[PDB]
Design a binder for this molecule. Structure first.
Ligand SMILES: Nc1nc2c(ncn2[C@@H]2O[C@H](COP(=O)(O)OP(=O)(O)OP(=O)(O)O)[C@@H](O)[C@H]2O)c(=O)[nH]1
Ligand SMILES: Nc1nc2c(ncn2[C@@H]2O[C@H](COP(=O)(O)OP(=O)(O)OP(=O)(O)O)[C@@H](O)[C@H]2O)c(=O)[nH]1
Ligand SMILES: Nc1nc2c(ncn2[C@@H]2O[C@H](COP(=O)(O)OP(=O)(O)O)[C@@H](O)[C@H]2O)c(=O)[nH]1
Ligand SMILES: [Mg+2]
Ligand SMILES: [Mg+2]
Lengths: 46, 426, 427, 38, 75, 436
């Protein structure tokens, strides 16, 4: 029983933990694109 | 916090333990009456590992004497320092094993073991944290070999997570005093290899040679042999009672020494041993202590370590010292004698230091080796056992009392594979 | 601005024993905690006129901590920060980690929590242990994981007394060290190794000590830690903090093992005569004879070094000495580091510690480098681990404690991957 | 036989401690749900 | 959507498990936790499999113990 | 604004013996009913109004009724170190013992002593000018505390009625226990205590042992150790009337802001900081951590985890020099704290009383002189578990009619046994229906 519990825990904690890295890369790159949006606004001001 | 209970089996064990308490009580500063009258506080600071306070400064040792005669206990009480013991621990029969393993393990052992476990349980319950037991006995008698073996097996069936330091005075042939030593020694080591966890080999042959050569004594009685054994036994276990720069307790020593699950048979030394004429013409430097410590005519065993490799070794120094000096000394020893050390273990040697030396001696040390030369004593007893047993000499005294023939042969086989494992690893 | 000190095992506790007696006299605080704000990083004012150190001493065997309880600093520490187990770990990694560790590590964490609550502006942790034994290895590899999963974002400076090749008191060090260095690779952030044999040689040569005990060693490491934290305790013309140091040095996430050095490590008789200045103290620190880990800096290219100058040092002679050391061809920097020095300075001279042979000097340099020279360290310890593990020796104790036979293999492969990483980044 | 039983009981206790310490180390499974939701 | 997604009683049972998982995935478009709780249910199924394997091995071991004790008693 | 005290049973009179010493030390009264001649006064001539009364020449006498049947502890007090302080007549000692028997405590022997204590109570009340309320101190696990205490509670409710009552009662621990037949007395006294005592404060022997073991660093505590901090708690409760409080709460604030329903009055108590001399000056006592230790479950006089329930409401009495900003920030931190959870129907549930008097120190004690202290009285809903566990203990005993003949040999029937049972059941139902 204790062995089965340890096996369950190691499997469930190995599955606990990288596409979010690339998705957040997209988020930050689009934040840059909206800094470019602000640039467009200042071009409108000019 | 750590606790040790000390048990004495047989006459040899009783005498060795009596001298051991005579030594350790002084090293703690308490007089025979039981009232402390020493000087410092480093003594009293951790004496709870051996003694129990009774009523306002009356300290009683945690030891149990046990045998099958009243005469030995009467002698122990009549001797000095025998008052401290609690009279309740004095357990004994009246008949006597009579150097008979069957009496000491099957009849009298059975009829006394239930009583003795009561008192050992009392001591092991009055404490708070046990780390291991101590047993003092021989391997060439009835009250010491068979009864001590039964006692340690009964302990193992009760405390399966503890060590025992079983100090076994092995029956040496040239110092043999009874006609059937091997019929006891083989049948004792049978279960010593199974249950006890640190069997310390000792032999009257090596003790007498030490006394004759180094001490230069003229009339060495059993007093001085017990003195040396007690000094070793008190030095091995000062890492608990005293604070050192590098502290190493019993479990640490056991795990460091024992590489494989059944090679626990330690050969032991002690330094410095001097005559009172040459103690004025010598220097107790650390290299000198190490050289005497590895002097092959100083280990308390008849098996010369030159006849084999060292599985591992351990040194326990006492007195304010230099740890770098210790380590470089042992490194020099290993490098110079690299042919005596197992090849598949780098740095075969362990070192520990305690900041308190035994009183008088401003510096001291102890050696515990696990060399493969130990097989010499076992082959040297197996030869005698086979030689007797080929024609069943003295065998009816055991067969009629309850042992079949196959048990002796199984003991032979166990002794043979025990002595063969060391040869295999050498 | 705070770092809290946790000492584990006898080596760490005694190193802290020297370190705190150094700090108390450096700040002016008596043993029983009273003056006759620089202490705020280490000492916290409690009540009125009483100061308590931000430290916890922890061990399983009780007598080593009882030494502190019965010494001269008995009034100083919080009477509970001196934790004690009941039975020693017996130099067994499995026993220290699993069997005994559970009952006491939760207490350690629940005390670290209230220490951090008492603190406000914490930089992080500084931990002391040795990866040779069982206590400081198992308890270290468990407590570090606990802190890295609870606080996570803090920096844990681990000053580890790594075991030396030739001089070695224990016998299961090749196992204990690999079992510790599995975790120590990926749970702490900066691991300053120290080697007993190297510091023995330093004591023998510079201080002409032929019987160097642990006390002098411990004083030496205490001085190193004081030089590391002086930039935070005090002010200087060019300072350095934990984030400064720890993001300047560590190039890649899995390469952080400092080499430590100190100067002028000189006794009084030579310190009164021989003159001292930056342009020769810096070279003296770089010399292999005065590096604290039994390693060979010549074999490995240097990646990034950090220098700290206690005492009166103007920021120009340090620049000149950096030039005059980078101009020497014997030491080779790594190819991709066009600049490989981070210098910091202070305004306080090192405080001579009564009871030692260390000099009272005008200025001193503490050097912490990161270089590929340490590959042979791991390689040789792994070689002797292989020696012991070829015949499955000593495995029975760990197996009976609970550890299987395969985690040894996984940790060995982890060390092998570490060595491969060092070789790749050396290339 | 009692010797063997005691050895097995000790092994069971060791595995108990191992499991509990692994639990304490990991948690200090309810994290995957919020991890995916984020 | 895709035919033959993966590339033998256990295998057949795995096929049924996969079909049921796709069915529940389509069924549920917190609501997401009800998928996570079924992940937990499949974990419990793995636990039952572990239980069965241990039962077989332990029964064999019990028989072996009976055999050794019988031989000892006979001798 | 005087408050009178009634101590019933050996436990009650021992607590009084260990608590009136605290009062006579706080108000600088010598332990023989007088003040020292020299000016050694903290300040004021009426800080002692609530407990004493000058009679012609500086001879103060406490407003205490020490009522007990068996006279072995009453005369122990009579011959103790407090002889010229106590009133010779207030100390009421009967003839024989109650012997763990609610029957003998409430019907046989009680009836001939309640009307003797009642006249002294009436004289004390008539002497009093601004009477505030009653503070009862008793043990439900014994005979006199449970039986005589419940009888006196009923016969004071029938007479005065409107006045508030604060009942500090001890219960048996879930495991640690001394008396064998204590469940019967506990349930029988609980039925009477339910609808008569205005506010019930709970104490537990083991719940104070374990605090004295983990905090005060005593591995062998005793009753003379528990009673000292019980006196500390009651002093923290009553200091508002005594000393000048910037944000102070009279006795009726407890009932006004901590009893949302008349049935619900059962309250956990906590007191911080429980520190001794060794660690006192090494730790720093601040309104954040003292409050946090107050709300941790390891420092409650009632052995019960507040996790299983929801804090309905709470009161925090602060002594010493405390600035209200820090306590406001501290209660904000508590409201942001995760583990303890409130019933959503109470958005404001922290009363924060504050005084200007630091905690006192008694010579030979354990607690040291400190700047500030806090007493936390919480109306939670974890106490239903306590009542239910006590009831489950009671059921096994009552199933086999054990010890029942001793009870029924007196006026006690089985009808009141059953009605006390169903009253505890109704209390269980009420607490659970409060629920979410
Ligand atoms: N610098 C320094 N190192 C020490 C000291 N004591 C031990 N060591 C080192 O610690 C290494 C092994 O650790 P241990 O001696 O077993 O100490 P530990 O790891 O705390 O083990 P425990 O006895 O269980 O507490 C040795 O190789 C020594 O080099 C010391 O006092 N000072
Ligand atoms: N904390 C604390 N509890 C006490 C003390 N004295 C008695 N008790 C408690 O009182 C309970 C039993 O009630 P009793 O002490 O006998 O009081 P009683 O109601 O007067 O009973 P009788 O003396 O027989 O009339 C025990 O379970 C104790 O827990 C005390 O000094 N301190
Ligand atoms: N060191 C020491 N050994 C002894 C002493 N007396 C006997 N022996 C040894 O112990 C062995 C006898 O063991 P014994 O105690 O008689 O066991 P028993 O026969 O069961 O009682 C002999 O071989 C002796 O060499 C003694 O006083 N001191
Ligand atoms: Mg250690
Ligand atoms: Mg009573």
């Amino acid at each position: 029983l204790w062995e089965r519990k340890i096996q369950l825990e190691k499997e469930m904690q190995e599955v606990l933990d990288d596409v979010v890295a690339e998705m957040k890369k997209e988020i930050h790159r689009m934040t840059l694109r909206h800094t470019e949006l602000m640039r467009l606004q200042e071009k409108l001001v000019s | 916090m750590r606790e040790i209970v000390h048990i004495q089996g047989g006459q040899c064990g009783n005498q060795i333990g009596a001298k051991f308490w005579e030594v350790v009580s002084d090293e703690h500063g308490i007089d025979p009456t039981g009232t402390y009258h020493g000087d410092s506080d480093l003594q009293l600071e951790r004496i709870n590992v051996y003694f129990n306070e009774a009523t306002g400064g009356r300290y009683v040792p945690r030891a149990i004497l046990m045998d099958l005669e009243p005469g030995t206990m009467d002698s122990v009480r009549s001797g000095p320092y025998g008052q401290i013991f609690r009279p309740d621990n004095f357990v004994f029969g009246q008949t006597g094993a009579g150097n008979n393993w069957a009496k000491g393990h099957y009849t009298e052992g059975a009829e006394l073991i239930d009583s003795v476990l009561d008192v050992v349980r009392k001591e092991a319950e009055s404490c708070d944290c046990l780390q291991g037991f101590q047993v003092c006995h021989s391997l060439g008698g009835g009250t010491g070999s068979g009864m001590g073996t039964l006692l340690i097996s009964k302990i193992r069936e009760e405390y399966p997570d503890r060590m025992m330091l079983t100090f076994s005075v092995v029956p040496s042939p040239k110092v043999s005093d009874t006609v059937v030593e091997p019929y006891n020694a083989t049948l004792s080591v049978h279960q010593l290899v199974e249950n006890a966890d640190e069997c310390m080999v000792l032999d009257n042959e090596a003790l007498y040679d030490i006394c004759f050569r180094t001490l230069k004594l003229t009339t060495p009685t059993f007093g001085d042999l017990n003195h040396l054994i007690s000094a070793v036994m008190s030095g091995i276990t000062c890492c608990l009672r005293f604070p050192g720069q590098l502290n190493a307790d019993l479990r640490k020593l056991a795990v460091n020494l024992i590489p494989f699950p059944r090679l626990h048979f330690f050969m032991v030394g002690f330094t410095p041993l001097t005559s009172r004429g040459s103690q004025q013409y010598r220097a107790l430097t650390v290299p000198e202590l190490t050289q005497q410590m590895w002097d092959a005519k100083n280990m308390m065993c008849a098996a010369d370590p030159r006849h084999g490799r060292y599985l591992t070794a351990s040194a326990l120094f006492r007195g304010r010292m230099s740890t770098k000096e210790v380590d470089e000394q042992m490194l020099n020893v290993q490098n110079k004698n690299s042919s005596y050390f197992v090849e598949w273990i780098p740095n075969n040697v362990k070192s520990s230091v305690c900041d308190i030396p035994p009183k008088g001696l401003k510096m001291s040390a102890t050696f515990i080796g696990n060399s493969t030369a130990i097989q010499e004593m076992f082959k040297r007893v197996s030869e005698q056992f086979t030689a007797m047993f080929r024609r069943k000499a003295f065998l009816h005294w055991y067969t009629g009392e309850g042992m079949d023939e196959m048990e002796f042969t199984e003991a032979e086989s166990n002794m043979n594979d025990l002595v063969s494992e060391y040869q295999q690893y050498q | 601005r705070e770092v809290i000190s946790i000492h584990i095992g006898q080596a760490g506790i005694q190193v802290g024993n020297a370190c705190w007696e150094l700090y108390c006299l450096e700040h002016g605080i008596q043993p029983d905690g009273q003056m006759p704000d620089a202490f705020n990083t280490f000492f916290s004012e409690t009540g009125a006129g009483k100061h308590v150190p931000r430290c916890i001493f922890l061990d399983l065997e009780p007598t080593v901590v009882d030494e502190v309880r019965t010494g001269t600093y008995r009034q100083l520490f919080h009477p509970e920060q001196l934790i004690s187990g009941k039975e020693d770990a017996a130099n067994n990694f499995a026993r220290g980690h699993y069997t005994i560790g559970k009952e006491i590590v939760d207490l350690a964490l629940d005390r670290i929590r209230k220490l951090a609550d008492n603190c406000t502006g914490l930089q992080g942790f500084l931990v002391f242990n040795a990866v040779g034994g069982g206590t400081g290895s198992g308890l270290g590899s468990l407590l570090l994981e606990r802190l890295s999963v609870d606080y996570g974002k803090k920096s844990k400076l681990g000053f580890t007394v790594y075991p030396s090749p030739q001089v070695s008191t224990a016998v299961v060090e090749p196992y204990n060290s690999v079992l510790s260095t599995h975790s120590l690779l990926e749970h702490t952030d900066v691991a300053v190794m120290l080697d007993n044999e190297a510091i023995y040689d330093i004591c023998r040569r510079s201080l002409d000590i032929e019987r160097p005990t642990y006390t002098n060693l411990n004083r030496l490491i205490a001085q190193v830690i004081s030089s590391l934290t002086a930039s935070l305790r005090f002010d200087g013309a060019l300072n350095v903090d934990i984030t400064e140091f720890q993001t300047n040095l560590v190039p890649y996430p899995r390469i952080h093992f400092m080499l430590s050095s100190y100067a002028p490590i000189i006794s009084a008789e030579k310190a009164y005569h021989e003159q001292l200045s930056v342009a020769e103290i810096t070279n003296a620190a770089f010399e292999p004879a005065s590096m604290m880990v039994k390693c060979d800096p010549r074999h490995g290219k240097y990646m990034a070094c950090c220098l700290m100058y206690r005492g009166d040092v103007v920021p120009k002679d340090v620049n000149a000495s950096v030039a005059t050391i980078k101009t020497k061809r014997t030491i080779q920097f790594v190819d991709w580091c066009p600049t490989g020095f981070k210098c910091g300075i202070n305004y306080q001279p090192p405080t001579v510690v009564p009871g030692g042979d260390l000099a009272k000097v005008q200025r001193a340099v503490c050097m912490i480098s990161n270089s590929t020279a340490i590959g042979e360290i791991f390689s040789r310890l792994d070689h002797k681990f292989d020696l012991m593990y070829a015949k499955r020796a000593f495995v029975h104790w760990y197996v009976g404690e609970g550890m299987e036979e395969g985690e040894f293999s996984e940790a060995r492969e982890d060390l092998a991957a570490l060595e491969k990483d060092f070789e790749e980044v050396g290339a | 036989i009692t010797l063997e039983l005691k050895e097995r009981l000790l092994r069971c206790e060791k595995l108990q401690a191992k499991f509990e310490i692994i639990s304490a180390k990991h948690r200090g499974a309810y994290y995957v749900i919020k991890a995916a939701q984020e | 959507d895709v035919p033959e997604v993966l590339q033998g009683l256990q295998e057949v049972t795995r096929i049924d498990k996969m079909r049921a998982k796709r069915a529940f995935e389509a069924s549920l478009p917190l609501r997401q936790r009800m998928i996570e709780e079924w992940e937990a249910k499949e974990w419990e199924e793995r636990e039952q499999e572990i239980l069965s394997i241990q039962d077989k091995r332990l029964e064999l071991l019990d028989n072996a113990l009976q055999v050794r004790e019988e031989e000892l008693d006979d001798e």
